[PDB]
Amino acid sequence: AKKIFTSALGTAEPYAYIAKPDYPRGVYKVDLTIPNKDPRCQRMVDEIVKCHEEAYAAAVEEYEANPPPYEGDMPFFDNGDGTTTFKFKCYASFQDKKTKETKHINLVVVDSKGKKMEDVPIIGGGSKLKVKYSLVPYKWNTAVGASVKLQLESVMLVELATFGGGEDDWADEVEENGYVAS
Amino acid sequence: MAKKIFTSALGTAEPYAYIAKPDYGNGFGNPRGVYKVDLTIPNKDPRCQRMVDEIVKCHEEAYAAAVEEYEANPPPLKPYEGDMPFFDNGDGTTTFKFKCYASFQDKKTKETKHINLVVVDSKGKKMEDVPIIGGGSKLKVKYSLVPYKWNTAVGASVKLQLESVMLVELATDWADEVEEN
Numbered sequence: 001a002k003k004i005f006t007s008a009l010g011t012a013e014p015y016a017y018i019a020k021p022d023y024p025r026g027v028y029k030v031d032l033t034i035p036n037k038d039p040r041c042q043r044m045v046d047e048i049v050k051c052h053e054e055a056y057a058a059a060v061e062e063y064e065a066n067p068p069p070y071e072g073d074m075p076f077f078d079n080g081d082g083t084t085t086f087k088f089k090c091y092a093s094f095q096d097k098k099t100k101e102t103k104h105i106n107l108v109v110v111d112s113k114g115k116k117m118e119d120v121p122i123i124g125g126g127s128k129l130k131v132k133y134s135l136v137p138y139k140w141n142t143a144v145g146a147s148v149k150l151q152l153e154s155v156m157l158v159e160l161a162t163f164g165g166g167e168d169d170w171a172d173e174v175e176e177n178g179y180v181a182s
Numbered sequence: 183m184a185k186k187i188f189t190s191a192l193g194t195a196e197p198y199a200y201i202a203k204p205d206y207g208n209g210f211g212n213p214r215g216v217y218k219v220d221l222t223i224p225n226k227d228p229r230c231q232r233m234v235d236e237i238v239k240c241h242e243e244a245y246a247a248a249v250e251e252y253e254a255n256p257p258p259l260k261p262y263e264g265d266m267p268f269f270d271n272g273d274g275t276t277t278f279k280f281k282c283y284a285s286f287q288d289k290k291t292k293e294t295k296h297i298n299l300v301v302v303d304s305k306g307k308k309m310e311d312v313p314i315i316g317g318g319s320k321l322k323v324k325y326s327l328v329p330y331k332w333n334t335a336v337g338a339s340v341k342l343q344l345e346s347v348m349l350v351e352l353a354t355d356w357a358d359e360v361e362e363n
């Protein structure tokens with residue numbers, strides 16, 4: 001069984017796949033950047049670290065008692081600018097293990113009032129969200145060491161970001177031989 | 183794992199790179215130190231597009247091989263792709279993520295050794311005392327491509343293994359004084 005954790009309110013990084021998965025088996029995903037000022041930010045980190053140290057401890061405690069170990073990177077990282085980014089992901093499909101078929105799972109997304117949306121807005125970078133998730137410790141492999149996966153369970157869309165209009169939007173509209181910053 | 187070596191286009195380093203010294207966050211997990219730099223390159227530089235082509239080709243090739251291997255005897259983990267080690271920033275630039283471990287266990291001798299990352303100036307002169315490379319610095323990097331299969335943690339992708347760095351131009355607040363007192 002899985003215990004549900006809820007993140008602090010954060011800002012979605014670009015390239016989120018919430019309204020639709022990133023497609024091979026699909027994957028929903030969002031990198032959520034939270035201000036370190038939010039105490040919930042440190043608690044999210046503490047929970048993940050605890051999970052890892054306990055699980056890795058156990059993993060080594062059986063590798064050694066029936067072999068055939070190293071640690072990997074945490075699913076979060078302080079950006080050094082007063083914010084920490086957390087990486088959430090979950091598959092878009094699974095195998096009906098009763099009746100064999102592959103089934104598509106849509107990620108539940110709720111608005112700020114808690115209302116589930118059928119037609120989910122595409123979530124652009126800068127959007128404010130809260131996410132519910134599970135901690136899924138995993139063992140070391142040839143690619144990366146043992147760590148924890150923040151398995152996405154659902155998302156609450158708090159603020160939908162505008163597409164365009166900012167600094168980036170202008171990259172596409174440069175003026176030859178014009179004014180240049182100082 | 184420095185076999186076929188590629189050279190990046192001239193780019194700009196994102197802040198908090200670890201080139202002059204590695205990142206020993208130890209961040210519990212890989213104790214191993216890590217050298218890393220995120221290099222942002224203008225999309226109109228032709229080498230940028232070629233860099234992407236090469237990574238994508240390496241990925242497609244290795245993923246195709248892994249998939250055929252898996253489908254030849256499906257041994258619950260299905261094939262899937264991870265994120266590429268580069269991303270278009272939507273502003274005419276693309277950021278590439280380079281990294282490598284700061285230590286390794288020797289194959290012949292089994293000795294764990296530390297790796298010093300070679301940094302060269304714009305004319306190829308090895309810099310003996312490497313300056314801390316701040317955000318905004320102009321660099322080129324040498325790297326190898328290390329593809330990897332999908333696993334429980336992440337989907338199949340490619341690591342841009344940092345090999346060495348050329349410092350073309352070194353760039354010139356509140357972190358230290360956080361919260362109270």
Ligand SMILES: [Ca+2]
Nearest residue numbers: 169170172173
């Ligand atoms: Ca535009």
